[PDB]
Design a protein around this nucleic acid. Structure first.
Ligand SMILES: [Mg+2]
Ligand SMILES: [Mg+2]
Ligand SMILES: [Mg+2]
Ligand SMILES: [Mg+2]
Ligand SMILES: [Mg+2]
Ligand SMILES: [Mg+2]
Ligand SMILES: [Mg+2]
Ligand SMILES: [Mg+2]
Ligand SMILES: [Mg+2]
Ligand SMILES: [Mg+2]
Ligand SMILES: [Mg+2]
Ligand SMILES: [Mg+2]
Ligand SMILES: [Mg+2]
Ligand SMILES: [Mg+2]
Ligand SMILES: [Mg+2]
Ligand SMILES: [Mg+2]
Ligand SMILES: [Mg+2]
Ligand SMILES: [Mg+2]
Ligand SMILES: [Mg+2]
Ligand SMILES: [Mg+2]
Length: 62
RNA sequence: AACCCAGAGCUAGCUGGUUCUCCCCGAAAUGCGUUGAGGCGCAGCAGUUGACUGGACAUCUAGGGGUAAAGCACUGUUUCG
């Protein structure tokens, strides 16, 4: 048969690899995994609530 | 305000750590607000993608100010006769 288990493959641009952060600096995303220095967005856990404005009265209340 | 076990991998806007390679582009430490000030949101500045534009550099001209300088005509201050 023309098509066979060992002559197939995906269309280019259809299946990217996926960023494996924390696997060196040459990979691109560094050791900090692309979150900068220490802060609140860089911590392991739930972040700020979407709409939160640092104690400022958010737009869904004013 | 005992010890052991469990809820419990409690929570930690705080420390520390986060592993292979090459190529291209490439910041910001400013403003507003905040039970906020070593945090966050938006704007500003990056990258990438798309659309619409033709400007940028240089030269000349025009337009309104009230700084430097200058001055004592006003407001104050001041020397001598
Ligand atoms: Mg880098
Ligand atoms: Mg390292
Ligand atoms: Mg990132
Ligand atoms: Mg660190
Ligand atoms: Mg940050
Ligand atoms: Mg947290
Ligand atoms: Mg929630
Ligand atoms: Mg833990
Ligand atoms: Mg619990
Ligand atoms: Mg460069
Ligand atoms: Mg600052
Ligand atoms: Mg600067
Ligand atoms: Mg308040
Ligand atoms: Mg208050
Ligand atoms: Mg602040
Ligand atoms: Mg701050
Ligand atoms: Mg810092
Ligand atoms: Mg803090
Ligand atoms: Mg921001
Ligand atoms: Mg002057």
């Amino acid at each position: 048969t023309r098509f066979r288990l060992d002559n197939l493959g995906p269309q280019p641009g259809s299946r990217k690899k996926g960023k494996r952060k924390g696997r060196g600096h040459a990979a691109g995303q560094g050791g900090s995994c692309g979150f900068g220095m220490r802060g609140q967005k860089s911590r392991s856990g739930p972040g700020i609530m979407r709409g939160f404005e640092g104690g400022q009265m958010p737009l869904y209340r004013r």
